[PDB]
Structure 1
Amino acid sequence: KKSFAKGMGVKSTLVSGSKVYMTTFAEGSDARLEKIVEGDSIRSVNEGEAFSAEMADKNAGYKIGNAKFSHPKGYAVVANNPLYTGPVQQDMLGLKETLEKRYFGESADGNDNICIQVIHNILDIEKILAEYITNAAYAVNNISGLDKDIIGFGKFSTVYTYDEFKDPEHHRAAFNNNDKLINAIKAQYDEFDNFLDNPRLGYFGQAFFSKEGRNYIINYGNECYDILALLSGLAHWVVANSRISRTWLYNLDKNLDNEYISTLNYLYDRITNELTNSFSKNSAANVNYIAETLGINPAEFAEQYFRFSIMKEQKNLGFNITKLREVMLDRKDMSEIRKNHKVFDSIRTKVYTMMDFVIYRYYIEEDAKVAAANKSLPDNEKSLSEKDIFVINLRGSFNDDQKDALYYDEANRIWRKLENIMHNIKEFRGNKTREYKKKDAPRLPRILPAGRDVSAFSKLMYALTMFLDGKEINDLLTTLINKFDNIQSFLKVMPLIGVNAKFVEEYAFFKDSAKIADELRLIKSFARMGEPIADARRAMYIDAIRILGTNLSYDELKALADTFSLDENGNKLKKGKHGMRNFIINNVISNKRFHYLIRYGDPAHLHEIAKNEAVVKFVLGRIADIQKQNGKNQIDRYYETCIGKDKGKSVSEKVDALTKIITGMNYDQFDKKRSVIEDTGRENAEREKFKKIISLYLTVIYHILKNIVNINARYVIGFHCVERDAQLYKEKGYDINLKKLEEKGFSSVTKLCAGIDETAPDKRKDVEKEMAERAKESIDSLESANPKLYANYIKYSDEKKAEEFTRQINREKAKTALNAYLRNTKWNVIIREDLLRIDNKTCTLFANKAVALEVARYVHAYINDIAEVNSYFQLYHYIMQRIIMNERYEKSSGKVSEYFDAVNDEKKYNDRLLKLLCVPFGYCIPRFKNLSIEALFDRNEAAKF
């Protein structure tokens, strides 16, 4: 539920000294000051008003009103007064002053609530970076080999140049002449060579291979070492409490040698130069057809089409073109684009791109014309553009059934001026595509930036993207862009409201947060372009024919794989005789989801996962239960393509048939039909059936693995947070011990913030006595404190007074807490009781396994032992608890041993055990509850609960 104040235009309410400054939305992420509050007086800075604000009753808030967007039910909207309670409000954990000191020196004084917000944005950036670097490192370690951990702590520490790493004897001054450390470097170089001739290194085609002609060539050893060292340096920086500190990422021009800068520049220039040098020959058809449709010379919009297609400037625009396009497609005049499959399944994307460009050009041209006209009129009477009016209406939409009506109405409004253009676009056919490629697109000056201009941080993010997949890249880069935009907006706002805080030198990198956002937008556009597989070798063929299912030994598999690209004599097959090789390459090896599965698992075990029936039915039912195209349509589409044409079957029967197809899967059904497969034609239905079956099978396994990886990422974030907060509380001046944080079950922070210590069998004599004496004082001093409650306390019965004395001790114990979360007596009586019954060695196991991603490596081992698969949260914690039981079951004692027995009996997870394992998160109640209760875990699954 969006708050009504944001719809009415109120964006922020800041405190500086004894004054309150309110701020409204201006453009994109920018902010404009609106009101200044002094005591009981409210002044408006600007001539116009984005919102009217007046003082409310008891000076407890400001009533907000807008002429256009009023509250639907007529209730009053009040924004809170930060000075009503007292001084500036504090952080929930009470770490405001420490963080402000760390990030701003003595230039911050504490009479404001603006610096803490940029600090929290930086903290969010670090959070998501720590989430994704772990997955990248695990992928690289998985691909490298077995027991060959090449990336982590203590390896490739980005301090040593490649020359010092290959011949340490000739460069022993850089190692401080230490024989033990020198012998460690040589052993690392041996692992480097063995990793560099791995046949399966080609899965990272972008990172290590470059395309020269029609075939890929491995980069020089310098570049590969530099990339690996950069990734290991990121891994070191994540766990920084050495030469890699917390400030390593923000000072990269003084910590990195010229080699690393050269490698990053090489990669960036490589991606930019191909896009620049291939635009004219690749954008000819679309540009020529659009020119014919509109009726203008291509030179009049070539650059604008460049910015639309390659740089993707239609996304930083204030709204979504795609929704308008879909509303346009919903009409009866243009419905055949969806119904007529046989004519449009090969030109759908071209038509969509053309329509989007037409809409975007319409808006851009209208805005430019209005802006040009608004140059001779007086600075008072000026008209807005259609972009501005649409964004103004969108911002004040209190819900979603109002936002969609706006899209519907404006699509219908702007359809009247583009009917002919769309009707001409709909008349496009693939056959006449080579006709529009005869004349090439106009040449352009360089628009994309070079490697030198971009910062090292952005280039390092682009390098990191080469170890991930599309969804993760999108999430990471979008979050980073949002956080940097917030930081830059706050930094521009701060001068106006009288705050003269400046970043300390080590964190001066954030003084230029606006350029980083633009660079990251370009990188988000770039990261999804390029071939990710390099070449195809025999190892990839074996992996492909091992995920479908075989019961063959290794030598037989090698012979079968050699059959792909060799004859019965020993020479290579002639051109055009590769028909089974191309099928496998195009249908398995070249699938993005297969790349995901290889990057996060073992091919032979994913087949074991796929032989299960319950998980397959669960995934297919999840597909079938998608509302708003529909999930029921997709189930029918699979059945019609994979099984055939039939009528009278319900959803359950189709799901059962598809499950039977998926569960029984083997490579022999293709080796026997090899003759049919090598018959390439348009009437070979069996070939298409095979393709559809393979695609669906891969999709199912991909979903199953992806959800597990996401949940593990959540728990990694949680433990990163507990480590960071332990460091901060130590720096504040408390009595935490960081060296013993691991032998204790990561629960020292929870003990520290709970308050008084009673678990000690030495001082229970005083704590129980001290609480008793302060409890008795509060009862006597009640009429003075709370007279209204005292008038009812006397009327209590004698027995009821006794209960209130027991509760008063819990209240007194809660007054000694060190958080704002744990000062509530409700949560303190809960967290304390959990502290007594934990097992320290079990909690350390949960933390270690989550970081290493060992849940994803043992799904197949315990998938057949589960009783039911109702959700991924329920499946995740069965595998996690079965792993812990393997190592610690004989030595377990207490309630944990009782809990372990329950898992073996009922064959599901234990709710009570999860709460004990989540005790490290107890000092932060929202994270403690979200990570321990299924109902609050997933935001998208809330209708079910």
Structure 2
Amino acid sequence: SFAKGMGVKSTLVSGSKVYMTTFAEGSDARLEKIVEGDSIRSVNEGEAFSAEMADKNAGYKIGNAKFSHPKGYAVVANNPLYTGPVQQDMLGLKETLEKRYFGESADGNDNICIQVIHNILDIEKILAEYITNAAYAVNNISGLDKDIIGFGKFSTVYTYDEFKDPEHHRAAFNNNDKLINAIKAQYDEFDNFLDNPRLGYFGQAFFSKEGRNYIINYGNECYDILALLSGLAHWVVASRISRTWLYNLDKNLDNEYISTLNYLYDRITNELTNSFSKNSAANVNYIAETLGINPAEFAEQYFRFSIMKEQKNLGFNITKLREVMLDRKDMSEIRKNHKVFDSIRTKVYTMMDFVIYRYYIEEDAKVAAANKSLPDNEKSLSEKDIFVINLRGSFNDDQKDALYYDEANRIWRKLENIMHNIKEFPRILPAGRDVSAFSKLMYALTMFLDGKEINDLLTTLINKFDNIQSFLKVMPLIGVNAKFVEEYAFFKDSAKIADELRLIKSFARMGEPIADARRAMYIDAIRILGTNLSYDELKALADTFSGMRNFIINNVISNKRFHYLIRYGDPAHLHEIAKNEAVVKFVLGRIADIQKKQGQNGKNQIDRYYETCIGKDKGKSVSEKVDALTKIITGMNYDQFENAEREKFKKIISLYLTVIYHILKNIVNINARYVIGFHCVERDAQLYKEKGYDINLKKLEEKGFSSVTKLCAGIDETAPDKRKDVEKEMAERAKESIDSLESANPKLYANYIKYSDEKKAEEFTRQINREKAKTALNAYLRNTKWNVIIREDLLRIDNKTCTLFANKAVALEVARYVHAYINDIAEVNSYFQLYHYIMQRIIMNERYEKSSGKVSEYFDAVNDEKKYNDRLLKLLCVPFGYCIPRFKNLSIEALFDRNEAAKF
């Protein structure tokens, strides 16, 4: 919107006043407006924007801002006091969440608390995707008999001394006989699993660095890490781990688990410092021997500038200055000589970047001091600002280089000696105990994930905490003095956690598999590419593994895209998901056509493999390239190993894994959204119970998870005991509403008389639905149309199907059983279709008794036309009916995906 970027950020309500906010430094906020009655009382000296009363006091005609409307129309901001008192949450749960989170402090006559609470609510839902992926990764690697790190596996409240030997530590168990034997079985399983060579795929969590080769830690650390991951799983989905576990960590966990988290944080931070101080000892030795300056301060800027982010808004590429600087004849041996400079390329480039940055900073500081001494009107812009202005004025690529060459030349004229010397040849991180356990556990969670997921998670968490801290800073100035209850007391120091997460981002990267677990990785690699050898002979080839063998080792074990799918390891399966030549077209077609749509200017992704597989010639068309590589993705059997034609299968390994990676990640992301939906329905059921409504929470599993939708839909019509009374009440209320219509809205009553006699019959039929809508409990299910749709849906639900849907969504069965039913789909046009076809097939496998009628017809449809049925999905999203946006986004193809909106 134009008003938001125009200079207006938020419009808050406290008491009878209105508190606008214009932007401030970073994500913070500054108060600029005070609206009361019909008055204008802008506070700041410099008016960021001007607003005045609009017509009928229904808004503010914002104007005289930085930039105006492109087509010349008034921009009006809604008055929050127009309707009446403070607007309510669409779910109608403002008071209960305010009381739960802020206790009795929150008065309730404000509009800032429930904006802070929703950020915590989004923190609760973001971690679902990443814990789902992390738990699936460990689940796949061993412990596949029944489950590992599940809802009943590990408790992180049992000390390892009390876990290994329950007999000697029976004091805390109150002398129980079943639990001790169950935990003995669990300890047997853990001891068997800890020695598994398959455990090497994960990095610093389990196999730690000692010297040239990784060494497994003691069982204490691994047991603690598994227990903590199981504790995260327990906290998210609900026992000593309630809904407030991660928020209260130090006082809840035993000293041993906190010791393990401190050990991991110390490991990573100390590794960074020791590396960049004495293991990259050449860099520090150059840092000390650079100029006549204090070594400690120089190192303090060097480390803070290199690894962290401080380049900020200086406005130009330093690296291209250094490129022009290297282009000269004096330092040509940097490129000409490859014997010695190759191992110090990064050091040299970083040092040149640092010295340029430091020169610019020092000049800026000196010029700023001079200008502060001088009058403000006459300002010396200095060289960095004149350079920025020159770059801004230019509008040609080559002309930019014409402007840009001179700066490098003159700085070389100034920086001769240090560059000649380079060419010729105070701990900062926050301890290991001051950091909260939340940050360490987030790091441990990221340590199981992929490169992109880490960045997404930490970026979103940082943004949410910045929002929280800015709102907390705004709270006192607007007259709200609500405080934090002891249970939810973690959110007071949101800024500190934000800083810790920023540092984690500065060192949160992938761990990468070990080099000691190669023996099992050969087995999994040969399994993925269609092996068919007998398992006795296959284990024989495994033990003898360490002809085409050498190819497997050298060109397979270390494949970059191999470490992206093995983390989702399904050895026995996963070769039948890219086996039918009707789903490879879709993923390749989509990526090549849309994602790499700018391959017209060079070698694309599919273009490279097409060129190397067709015979290094031919340029027919994109579609012919999509339908030619699929026949090479399909039938990637190991059993074959005219030889040149067979070599294509070796030639196209790196795309196979990419296809499987896309498919699996899309499936798990969709499943994670469905898990988010069910977590939301559970928490909303609990909240509606706490508010004081009529609900049965114990029998929520038995009923088809439709308790919340049934309650929020309004009056009850499923019970056949008093249908006559309900019908009579609705009829009399509709009749009363129709009779007293002129006083309600005279304009409609004026036209009502001219209607025909039968149109009155339709009007009464619709007024019955109108009254049933009036008898509801929610804002979403208050308009008649969605209420009648949901009411029609509710009458046709089968509870066992819903229960199976929920159980298989939570248990992640689809990502573990996809191989069974994927070859019986004729056409695929969206990931939605594939996921849901798998869903109805898994529901197929069980429900074959006592389902005569609608569900029977729908499953008949899946078996025959081999395409997922939209109506079955619409009946299976009934548990999601109290939030209409979510109900649509999880049942309509067009509205599911934000990226996919152009075609629909």
Q: CA deviation at 1:74?
A: 1.6
Q: Which moved more, 1:474-483 or 1:139-148?
A: 139-148
Q: Report how many aligned residue pairs link the two structures.
A: 901
Task: Note the alpha carbon deviations across 1:369-422, whole angstroms, 9 max, x for none.
Answer: 666556546899999999999999999999999999999999999999999999
Residue 300 and residue 268 in structure 1: after superposition, are their counterparts in 2 closer, same or farther (change >3 A)?
A: closer
Q: CA deviation at 1:490?
A: 0.3
Query: 3-state SS of the aligned residue for 1:691?
Result: helix
Q: CA deviation at 1:170?
A: 1.4
Check whether the contact 2:201–2:517 (CA below 8 A) recurs between aligned residues. Answer: no
Check whether the contact 1:61–1:78 (CA below 8 A) recurs between aligned residues. Answer: yes
Q: CA deviation at 1:43?
A: 0.9
Q: CA deviation at 1:71?
A: 1.5
Q: Which moved more, 1:351-360 or 1:933-942?
A: 351-360
Query: 3-state SS of the aligned residue for 1:159?
Result: coil
Query: 3-state SS of the aligned residue for 1:113?
Result: coil
Check whether the contact 1:546–1:603 (CA below 8 A) recurs between aligned residues. Answer: yes
Residue 304 and residue 178 in structure 1: after superposition, are their counterparts in 2 closer, same or farther (change >3 A)?
A: same
Check whether the contact 1:601–1:856 (CA below 8 A) recurs between aligned residues. Answer: no
Equivalent residue for 1:676? none
Task: Note the alpha carbon deviations across 1:491-526, whole angstroms, 9 max, x for none.
Answer: 000000000000111111100000111111221232
Residue 696 and residue 368 in structure 1: after superposition, are their counterparts in 2 closer, same or farther (change >3 A)?
A: farther
Q: Which moved more, 1:487-496 or 1:246-255?
A: 246-255
Q: CA deviation at 1:785?
A: 1.4
Equivalent residue for 1:39? 37
Task: Note the alpha carbon deviations across 1:636-655, whole angstroms, 9 max, x for none.
Answer: 22233455521333223333
Q: CA deviation at 1:556?
A: 1.9
CA distance in 1, matches of 2:325, 2:768: 67
Task: Note the alpha carbon deviations across 1:316-355, whole angstroms, 9 max, x for none.
Answer: 9999999999999999999999999999999999999899
Q: Which of 333, 342, 345 lines up with 2:342 in the alignment?
A: 345
The reply to whether residue 658 of structure 1 matches residue 629 of structure 2 is yes
Q: CA deviation at 1:114?
A: 0.2
Check whether the contact 1:587–1:695 (CA below 8 A) recurs between aligned residues. Answer: no
Task: Note the alpha carbon deviations across 1:51-78, whole angstroms, 9 max, x for none.
Answer: 1111111111112224432221121111
Check whether the contact 1:597–1:603 (CA below 8 A) recurs between aligned residues. Answer: no
Query: 3-state SS of the aligned residue for 2:31?
Result: strand
Q: CA deviation at 1:188?
A: 1.2
Q: CA deviation at 1:900?
A: 0.6
Q: CA deviation at 1:730?
A: 0.5
Check whether the contact 1:601–1:857 (CA below 8 A) recurs between aligned residues. Answer: no
Residue 830 and residue 54 in structure 1: after superposition, are their counterparts in 2 closer, same or farther (change >3 A)?
A: same
Check whether the contact 1:54–1:63 (CA below 8 A) recurs between aligned residues. Answer: yes
Query: 3-state SS of the aligned residue for 2:62?
Result: strand
Residue 49 and residue 586 in structure 1: after superposition, are their counterparts in 2 closer, same or farther (change >3 A)?
A: farther
Unaligned runs of 5+ in 1: 429-444, 566-578, 671-682
Residue 881 and residue 690 in structure 1: after superposition, are their counterparts in 2 closer, same or farther (change >3 A)?
A: closer
CA distance in 2, matches of 1:407, 1:828: 64
CA distance in 2, matches of 1:718, 1:331: 61
CA distance in 1, matches of 2:459, 2:345: 27
Check whether the contact 1:618–1:870 (CA below 8 A) recurs between aligned residues. Answer: yes
Task: Note the alpha carbon deviations across 1:582-632, whole angstroms, 9 max, x for none.
Answer: 754554333454334233241332222222211112222112213589797
Q: Which moved more, 1:842-851 or 1:580-589?
A: 580-589
CA distance in 2, matches of 1:74, 1:360: 45
Q: CA deviation at 1:771?
A: 0.8
Check whether the contact 2:197–2:517 (CA below 8 A) recurs between aligned residues. Answer: no
Q: CA deviation at 1:784?
A: 1.2
Task: Note the alpha carbon deviations across 1:240-281, whole angstroms, 9 max, x for none.
Answer: 3x3222222111111111111211111111112222122257
Residue 25 and residue 587 in structure 1: after superposition, are their counterparts in 2 closer, same or farther (change >3 A)?
A: farther
Task: Note the alpha carbon deviations across 1:431-475, whole angstroms, 9 max, x for none.
Answer: xxxxxxxxxxxxxx3222321121111111111222222222222
Q: Which of 601, 604, 609 lines up with 1:630 in the alignment?
A: 601
Query: 3-state SS of the aligned residue for 1:608?
Result: coil
Q: Which moved more, 1:511-520 or 1:319-328?
A: 319-328
CA distance in 1, matches of 2:728, 2:703: 28
Q: CA deviation at 1:311?
A: 2.8
CA distance in 2, matches of 1:660, 1:752: 53
CA distance in 2, matches of 1:827, 1:552: 57
CA distance in 2, matches of 1:615, 1:333: 57
CA distance in 2, matches of 1:9, 1:195: 58
Equivalent residue for 2:136? 138
Q: Which of 56, 65, 70 lines up with 2:68 in the alignment?
A: 70
The reply to whether residue 689 of structure 1 matches residue 648 of structure 2 is yes
CA distance in 2, matches of 1:61, 1:110: 24
Q: CA deviation at 1:30?
A: 0.7
CA distance in 2, matches of 1:648, 1:269: 56
Task: Note the alpha carbon deviations across 1:171-193, whole angstroms, 9 max, x for none.
Answer: 11100111122222211111110
CA distance in 2, matches of 1:259, 1:290: 40
Residue 149 and residue 353 in structure 1: after superposition, are their counterparts in 2 closer, same or farther (change >3 A)?
A: farther
Residue 288 and residue 174 in structure 1: after superposition, are their counterparts in 2 closer, same or farther (change >3 A)?
A: closer
CA distance in 2, matches of 1:188, 1:57: 71
Q: CA deviation at 1:168?
A: 1.2
Task: Note the alpha carbon deviations across 1:842-899, whole angstroms, 9 max, x for none.
Answer: 1111111111111112222222110101111111110111110110033322311111
Check whether the contact 2:116–2:468 (CA below 8 A) recurs between aligned residues. Answer: yes
Q: CA deviation at 1:162?
A: 0.7
CA distance in 2, matches of 1:718, 1:928: 9
Residue 279 and residue 87 in structure 1: after superposition, are their counterparts in 2 closer, same or farther (change >3 A)?
A: same
Residue 48 and residue 853 in structure 1: after superposition, are their counterparts in 2 closer, same or farther (change >3 A)?
A: same
Residue 495 and residue 852 in structure 1: after superposition, are their counterparts in 2 closer, same or farther (change >3 A)?
A: same
Check whether the contact 1:922–1:928 (CA below 8 A) recurs between aligned residues. Answer: yes
Check whether the contact 1:291–1:298 (CA below 8 A) recurs between aligned residues. Answer: yes
Check whether the contact 2:808–2:814 (CA below 8 A) recurs between aligned residues. Answer: yes
CA distance in 2, matches of 1:392, 1:716: 52
Check whether the contact 2:287–2:299 (CA below 8 A) recurs between aligned residues. Answer: no
Residue 686 and residue 766 in structure 1: after superposition, are their counterparts in 2 closer, same or farther (change >3 A)?
A: closer
TM-score normalised according to structure 2 size: 0.88
Task: Note the alpha carbon deviations across 1:476-496, whole angstroms, 9 max, x for none.
Answer: 222211111111000000000
Check whether the contact 1:866–1:908 (CA below 8 A) recurs between aligned residues. Answer: yes
Task: Note the alpha carbon deviations across 1:565-595, whole angstroms, 9 max, x for none.
Answer: 2xxxxxxxxxxxxx97775455433345433
Equivalent residue for 2:182? 184
TM-score normalised according to structure 1 size: 0.84
Q: Which of 529, 532, 546 lines up with 1:548 in the alignment?
A: 529
Residue 798 and residue 505 in structure 1: after superposition, are their counterparts in 2 closer, same or farther (change >3 A)?
A: same
Q: Which moved more, 1:296-305 or 1:515-524?
A: 296-305
Residue 507 and residue 407 in structure 1: after superposition, are their counterparts in 2 closer, same or farther (change >3 A)?
A: farther
Residue 320 and residue 108 in structure 1: after superposition, are their counterparts in 2 closer, same or farther (change >3 A)?
A: farther
Q: Which moved more, 1:334-343 or 1:607-616?
A: 334-343
Query: 3-state SS of the aligned residue for 1:54?
Result: strand
Check whether the contact 1:541–1:561 (CA below 8 A) recurs between aligned residues. Answer: yes
CA distance in 2, matches of 1:272, 1:835: 55
Check whether the contact 2:451–2:510 (CA below 8 A) recurs between aligned residues. Answer: no
Residue 416 and residue 700 in structure 1: after superposition, are their counterparts in 2 closer, same or farther (change >3 A)?
A: farther
Equivalent residue for 2:548? 580
Identity rate, percent: 100
Residue 228 and residue 427 in structure 1: after superposition, are their counterparts in 2 closer, same or farther (change >3 A)?
A: same
Q: Which moved more, 1:726-735 or 1:205-214?
A: 205-214
Q: CA deviation at 1:561?
A: 2.9
Check whether the contact 1:745–1:839 (CA below 8 A) recurs between aligned residues. Answer: yes
CA distance in 1, matches of 2:410, 2:878: 57
Residue 164 and residue 401 in structure 1: after superposition, are their counterparts in 2 closer, same or farther (change >3 A)?
A: farther
Q: Which moved more, 1:584-593 or 1:919-928?
A: 584-593
CA distance in 2, matches of 1:813, 1:325: 73
Unaligned runs of 5+ in 2: none
Equivalent residue for 1:504? 485
Q: CA deviation at 1:214?
A: 1.2
Residue 322 and residue 5 in structure 1: after superposition, are their counterparts in 2 closer, same or farther (change >3 A)?
A: farther
CA RMSD of aligned residues (A): 5.3
Check whether the contact 2:730–2:771 (CA below 8 A) recurs between aligned residues. Answer: yes
Query: 3-state SS of the aligned residue for 2:170?
Result: helix
Check whether the contact 2:632–2:649 (CA below 8 A) recurs between aligned residues. Answer: no
Residue 164 and residue 295 in structure 1: after superposition, are their counterparts in 2 closer, same or farther (change >3 A)?
A: closer
Q: CA deviation at 1:291?
A: 13
Q: CA deviation at 1:543?
A: 0.6
Q: CA deviation at 1:150?
A: 2.6
Check whether the contact 1:31–1:489 (CA below 8 A) recurs between aligned residues. Answer: yes
Q: CA deviation at 1:151?
A: 1.4
CA distance in 2, matches of 1:916, 1:807: 24
Query: 3-state SS of the aligned residue for 2:424?
Result: coil
